[PDB]
Amino acid sequence: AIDFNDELRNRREKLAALRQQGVAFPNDFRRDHTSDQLHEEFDAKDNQELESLNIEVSVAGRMMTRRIMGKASFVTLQDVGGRIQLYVARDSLPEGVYNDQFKKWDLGDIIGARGTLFKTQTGELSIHCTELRLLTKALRPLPDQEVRYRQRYLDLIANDKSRQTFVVRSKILAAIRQFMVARGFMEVETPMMQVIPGGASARPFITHHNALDLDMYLRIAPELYLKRLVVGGFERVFEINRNFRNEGISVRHNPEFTMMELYMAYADYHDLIELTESLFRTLAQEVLGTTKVTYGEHVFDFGKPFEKLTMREAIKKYRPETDMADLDNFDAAKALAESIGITVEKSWGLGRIVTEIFDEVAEAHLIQPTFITEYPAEVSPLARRNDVNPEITDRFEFFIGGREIGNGFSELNDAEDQAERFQEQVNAKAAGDDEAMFYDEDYVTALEYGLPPTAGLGIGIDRMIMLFTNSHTIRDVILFPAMRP
Amino acid sequence: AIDFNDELRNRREKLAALRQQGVAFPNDFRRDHTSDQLHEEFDAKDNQELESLNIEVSVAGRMMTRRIMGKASFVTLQDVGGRIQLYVARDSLPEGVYNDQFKKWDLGDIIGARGTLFKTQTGELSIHCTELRLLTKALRPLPDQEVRYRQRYLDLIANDKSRQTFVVRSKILAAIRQFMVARGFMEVETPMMQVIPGGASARPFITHHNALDLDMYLRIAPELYLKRLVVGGFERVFEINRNFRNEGISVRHNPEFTMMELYMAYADYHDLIELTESLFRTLAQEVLGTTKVTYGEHVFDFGKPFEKLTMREAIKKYRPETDMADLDNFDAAKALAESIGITVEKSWGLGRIVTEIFDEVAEAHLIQPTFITEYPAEVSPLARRNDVNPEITDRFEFFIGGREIGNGFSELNDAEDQAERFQEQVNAKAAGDDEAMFYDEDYVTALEYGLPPTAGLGIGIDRMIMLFTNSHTIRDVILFPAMRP
Numbered sequence: 006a007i008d009f010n011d012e013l014r015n016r017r018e019k020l021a022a023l024r025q026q027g028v029a030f031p032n033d034f035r036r037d038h039t040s041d042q043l044h045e046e047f048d049a050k051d052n053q054e055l056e057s058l059n060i061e062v063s064v065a066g067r068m069m070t071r072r073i074m075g076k077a078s079f080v081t082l083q084d085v086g087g088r089i090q091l092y093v094a095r096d097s098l099p100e101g102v103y104n105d106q107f108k109k110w111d112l113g114d115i116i117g118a119r120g121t122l123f124k125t126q127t128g129e130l131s132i133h134c135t136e137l138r139l140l141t142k143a144l145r146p147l148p149d150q151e152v153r154y155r156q157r158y159l160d161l162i163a164n165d166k167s168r169q170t171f172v173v174r175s176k177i178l179a180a181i182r183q184f185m186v187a188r189g190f191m192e193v194e195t196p197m198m199q200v201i202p203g204g205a206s207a208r209p210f211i212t213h214h215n216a217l218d219l220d221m222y223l224r225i226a227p228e229l230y231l232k233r234l235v236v237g238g239f240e241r242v243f244e245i246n247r248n249f250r251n252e253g254i255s256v257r258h259n260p261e262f263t264m265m266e267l268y269m270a271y272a273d274y275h276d277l278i279e280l281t282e283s284l285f286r287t288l289a290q291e292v293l294g295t296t297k298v299t300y301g302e303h304v305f306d307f308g309k310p311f312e313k314l315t316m317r318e319a320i321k322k323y324r325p326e327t328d329m330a331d332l333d334n335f336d337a338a339k340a341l342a343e344s345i346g347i348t349v350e351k352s353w354g355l356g357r358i359v360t361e362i363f364d365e366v367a368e369a370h371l372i373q374p375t376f377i378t379e380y381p382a383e384v385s386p387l388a389r390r391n392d393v394n395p396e397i398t399d400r401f402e403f404f405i406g407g408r409e410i411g412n413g414f415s416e417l418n419d420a421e422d423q424a425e426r427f428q429e430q431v432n433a434k435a436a437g438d439d440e441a442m443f444y445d446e447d448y449v450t451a452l453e454y455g456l457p458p459t460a461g462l463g464i465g466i467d468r469m470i471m472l473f474t475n476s477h478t479i480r481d482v483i484l485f486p487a488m489r490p
Numbered sequence: 491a492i493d494f495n496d497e498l499r500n501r502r503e504k505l506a507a508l509r510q511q512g513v514a515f516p517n518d519f520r521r522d523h524t525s526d527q528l529h530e531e532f533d534a535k536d537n538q539e540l541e542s543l544n545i546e547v548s549v550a551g552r553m554m555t556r557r558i559m560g561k562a563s564f565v566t567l568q569d570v571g572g573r574i575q576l577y578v579a580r581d582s583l584p585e586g587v588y589n590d591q592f593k594k595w596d597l598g599d600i601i602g603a604r605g606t607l608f609k610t611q612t613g614e615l616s617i618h619c620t621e622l623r624l625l626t627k628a629l630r631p632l633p634d635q636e637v638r639y640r641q642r643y644l645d646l647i648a649n650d651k652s653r654q655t656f657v658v659r660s661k662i663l664a665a666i667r668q669f670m671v672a673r674g675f676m677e678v679e680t681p682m683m684q685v686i687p688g689g690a691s692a693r694p695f696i697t698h699h700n701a702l703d704l705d706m707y708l709r710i711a712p713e714l715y716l717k718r719l720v721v722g723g724f725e726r727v728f729e730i731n732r733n734f735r736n737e738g739i740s741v742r743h744n745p746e747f748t749m750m751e752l753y754m755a756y757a758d759y760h761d762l763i764e765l766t767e768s769l770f771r772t773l774a775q776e777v778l779g780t781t782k783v784t785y786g787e788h789v790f791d792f793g794k795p796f797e798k799l800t801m802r803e804a805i806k807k808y809r810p811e812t813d814m815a816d817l818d819n820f821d822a823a824k825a826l827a828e829s830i831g832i833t834v835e836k837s838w839g840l841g842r843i844v845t846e847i848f849d850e851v852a853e854a855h856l857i858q859p860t861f862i863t864e865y866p867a868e869v870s871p872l873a874r875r876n877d878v879n880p881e882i883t884d885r886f887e888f889f890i891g892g893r894e895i896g897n898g899f900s901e902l903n904d905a906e907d908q909a910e911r912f913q914e915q916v917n918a919k920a921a922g923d924d925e926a927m928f929y930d931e932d933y934v935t936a937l938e939y940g941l942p943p944t945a946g947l948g949i950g951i952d953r954m955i956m957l958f959t960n961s962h963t964i965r966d967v968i969l970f971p972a973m974r975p
């Protein structure tokens with residue numbers, strides 16, 4: 006109880022003493038190895054080899070454990086690569102260091118050491134220190150379950166599983182770039198501040214640029230800019246960056262999230278389906294070492310094709326008692342939708358209602374990697390219209406673990422059609438839809454110069470990271486998740 | 491004059507005719523080569539080889555030029571890789587295609603072709619078409635000098651020099667990541683939305699999160715979050731992403747810009763100076779093929795050390811008549827500063843005034859790569875204090891071409907000191923400084939758990955791209971620069 010406050014007092018008093026001796030916070034010690042490197046290279050050698058090899062190394066990190074056994078002590082040092090053992094002896098270090106310094110330090114303190122490698126009796130790699138210093142005094146002792154997100158630094162210091170998740174996240178992004186670049190895609194950077202937001206249907210965050218006295222929006226998606234680049238000639242482009250949506254926090258929603266959008270000219274959604282399946286198979290293999298991934302109580306085989314259903318088949322499959330003819334009549338669909346709890350807004354049309362039914366009925370059940378095709382035109386203002394049925398577009402979305410992971414389609418390169426769909430969106434907004442798109446005249450103009458037939462795909466990177474790290478909340482894969490005040 | 495309006499009418503009428511025939515905008519043609527690939531592999535072969543090789547290929551792109559010479563025509567097709575010649579003959583293509591289709595197309599139209607490779611009389615690589623289709627009808631004919639930025643797609647279609655600049659930008663970013671990863675740095679993603687902005691001194695953009703009824707700011711810098719990660723154990727981290735500052739547009743300022751911040755524990759600013767010099771030498775060599783870079787009327791030798799001066803030496807060197815003792819007296823410095831046009835604010839102290847004098851006096855003259863050291867503590871609230879002179883910090887900034895390219899320093903890991911400097915910043919804001927930092931209690935707490943001695947560096951990526959593409963305005967290296975309404 007008060008033992009924590011005495012820890013704080015003791016640390017402040019120890020620091021006060023450092024201040025009297027000179028510069029309490031130096032920046033001089035230099036290491037030449039991290040724990041992971043030492044283990045990788047020497048774990049395999051026995052004390053005989055290490056003895057004859059007589060290798061001296063320098064490390065630095067946090068003092069996680071210390072066991073003082075008189076004139077000798079054993080310490081666990083934790084650095085960016087992991088942990089390494091230190092053997093600290095009074096007569097191995099310079100005079101007075103052991104008793105006047107080392108013993109006065111505290112767990113959590115950042116220290117630096119230089120010594121010779123050897124293996125303990127237990128067979129562990131250890132460093133027989135010949136030099137040891139205090140680099141940074143820790144004024145606070147080593148660390149709801151919301152603290153993990155409120156003070157991510159404590160979570161990273163304490164939980165190796167959490168560290169691993171974020172290291173894997175970095176590995177995945179690097180692997181995605183390598184995968185895309187290998188296919189001739191070029192990474193670009195489009196605006197995050199837009200006067201006219203678009204590319205998706207969402208409530209945007211709004212701000213003000215004083216210099217131009219201009220109201221602006223944080224981008225909800227880079228889609229319209231990326232397609233402008235394809236018109237410009239960058240026929241294989243991708244962007245992996247933040248999107249912002251003014252909506253509430255959830256187990257799979259963060260106000261700002263990372264997404265990858267890619268566009269490849271002279272391709273259709275079928276090509277995106279193949280790319281998606283290859284990306285997941287490649288990432289699982291390259292990053293996890295296997296194509297079979299364990300997530301919760303399930304196993305995803307990214308080595309076999311994703312399942313594929315139309316939106317209606319998914320609805321019929323998860324609500325078998327559904328009279329499919331109901332989805333063809335506005336009144337029947339509206340009634341059906343409401344019967345299952347969906348509040349049908351005045352602006353909604355049949356296509357929107359059917360899509361909403363799909364969300365309510367099937368989304369949660371798409372556990373194994375699944376592609377859902379035939380999205381209604383009403384909810385896809387930027388997607389290419391299907392050749393045989395104009396009411397649907399050549400678009401799909403894919404789900405894994407009951408969550409939507411991606412969205413893709415053959416792009417709409419028909420300027421006149423696009424302008425009309427933008428007008429419908431404007432009417433919708435006027436009829437109450439706060440997520441309807443804004444009319445973008447310059448985008449239409451770009452399409453008039455000519456956009457090659459193209460296929461674009463958007464993938465939620467955070468949602469994807471969850472599947473590769475067995476995380477069941479998006480808050481576990483975002484270093485600093487948005488939190489309630 | 492009206493000839494443009496007849497171009498528009500003619501294109502709309504041609505499209506109307508396509509609509510009557512069926513689906514005007516197909517998405518079916520697939521290519522297997524881009525122009526750059528064809529040239530790289532076959533430019534070196536003469537017509538004899540190509541003839542015996544009998545290679546058939548498929549390409550797609552924009553029809554840039556067409557010369558109809560009766561039953562045969564010559565076309566320049568432009569794709570993502572560049573341009574390739576097409577040989578279009580009535581009797582080489584399927585019946586009626588040449589006369590009923592090909593001749594009706596327009597420059598700018600997106601087309602697809604399949605044919606055999608050969609070399610023209612002029613010795614150019616060309617494709618003797620056996621199949622040719624119209625993929626996308628262009629409703630507008632091929633393209634102040636502000637249009638380039640207002641409709642970047644037209645600029646990319648028209649100017650190859652502009653395309654090259656952006657391709658090089660992508661190459662540079664990829665090269666930076668490779669450089670950093672080679673040094674054990676791990677790329678992370680920190681928040682772009684922050685309740686308390688910090689890490690720099692700037693006017694932020696503010697927005698509102700409806701869900702939490704919480705006012706938030708677009709990040710002006712990720713610094714405070716990145717250092718939290720170093721405390722957490724990610725001792726070598728970097729982030730390359732957008733920053734937002736509520737300030738006016740300029741030749742070197744965009745409201746949103748890309749920056750790289752990197753932090754490496756157990757290092758000081760001297761280590762950052764070496765890293766900076768190696769990064770520029772590596773990028774110039776790897777990307778431009780030489781360490782000597784031509785920019786405007788100058789040549790930068792990234793093969794030799796950057797010049798290095800203290801802030802005072804730079805001031806003395808560019809305003810030789812300066813009585814250096816003036817920089818040691820608030821009144822003299824204030825008078826000096828005002829005499830050269832600087833409006834001294836009530837909140838400013840000596841350190842701030844001297845820094846402002848440096849900006850006015852020397853910044854523009856630092857043409858060759860230069861490091862400026864000894865930044866006053868007043869203008870460096872997050873930097874490590876110098877051991878011998880507490881009034882200055884172990885920080886530097888570097889300039890190239892009269893513009894600031896980077897900012898780095900040994901990080902402040904003294905929690906008590908940091909808290910105090912935050913308080914001074916709060917007082918400053920209360921005294922009128924609208925760019926002063928906000929007090930960040932959680933950041934101070936993170937430092938209390940212990941931040942290893944660290945060196946951090948921030949580099950303006952757009953400013954850096956300018957130097958490698960001979961661009962003299964930041965608007966030439968950002969795909970969609972911020973523009974006045």
Ligand SMILES: Nc1ncnc2c1ncn2[C@@H]1O[C@H](COP(=O)(O)OP(=O)(O)OP(=O)(O)O)[C@@H](O)[C@H]1O
Pocket residue numbers: 205206250257258259260261262263264409410411412463464465466467468479
């Ligand atoms: N708030 C969010 N947090 C994290 N990822 C998100 C969020 N919103 C959307 N995404 C991801 O971005 C992708 C593309 O955006 P899209 O507009 O399709 O999302 P969405 O369908 O609105 O998402 P959901 O159905 O999960 O609410 C989604 O497929 C999803 O993976």
Ligand SMILES: Nc1ncnc2c1ncn2[C@@H]1O[C@H](COP(=O)(O)OP(=O)(O)OP(=O)(O)O)[C@@H](O)[C@H]1O
Pocket residue numbers: 690691735742743744745746747748749894895896897948949950951952953964
């Ligand atoms: N508006 C901007 N547009 C582009 N790059 C910028 C902008 N503001 C700052 N930078 C870059 O970000 C780096 C780090 O931010 P910093 O706060 O040091 O900039 P700054 O000193 O305010 O810039 P300047 O002196 O050029 O106005 C700068 O060194 C510069 O390269």
Ligand SMILES: N[C@@H](CCCC[NH3+])C(=O)O
Pocket residue numbers: 204205225226227228266387412413414416461462463464
């Ligand atoms: N912009 C879409 C993803 C890309 C769709 C294909 N053009 C979204 O935000 O969901």
Ligand SMILES: N[C@@H](CCCC[NH3+])C(=O)O
Pocket residue numbers: 689690710711712713751872897898899901946947948949
């Ligand atoms: N945050 C600084 C760059 C990093 C400084 C070193 N900690 C800036 O915005 O200029």
Ligand SMILES: [Mn+2]
Pocket residue numbers: none
């Ligand atoms: Mn949503």
Ligand SMILES: [Mn+2]
Pocket residue numbers: 409
């Ligand atoms: Mn959805």
Ligand SMILES: [Mn+2]
Pocket residue numbers: 402409412
């Ligand atoms: Mn969706």
Ligand SMILES: [Mn+2]
Pocket residue numbers: none
């Ligand atoms: Mn500035």
Ligand SMILES: [Mn+2]
Pocket residue numbers: 894
């Ligand atoms: Mn500056």
Ligand SMILES: [Mn+2]
Pocket residue numbers: 887894897
């Ligand atoms: Mn600066």
